[PDB]
Point group: none
């Protein structure tokens, strides 16, 4: 007593919004 | 009773990618 | 009788970084 332990908990939440990516490639010719 | 609470559930799901990165440098002159 | 469900599991994996940015602006004339 109490009794047997309950089931595991639910899946956690997502991690916050991710960082932006790296810079794009160079621009076009002049 | 009730028995004690169960343990923590599993880690959360994968998240979406972050936002696009900054434009790159000016092209060639 | 078995106790209550366990608490929520921890945060998921870090959301990846975003896709690369766009090409830059044209170069000097």
């Amino acid at each position: 007593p109490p009794g047997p332990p309950g089931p595991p908990g639910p899946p956690g939440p997502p991690a916050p919004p991710g960082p932006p990516g790296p810079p794009g490639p160079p621009g076009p010719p002049g």
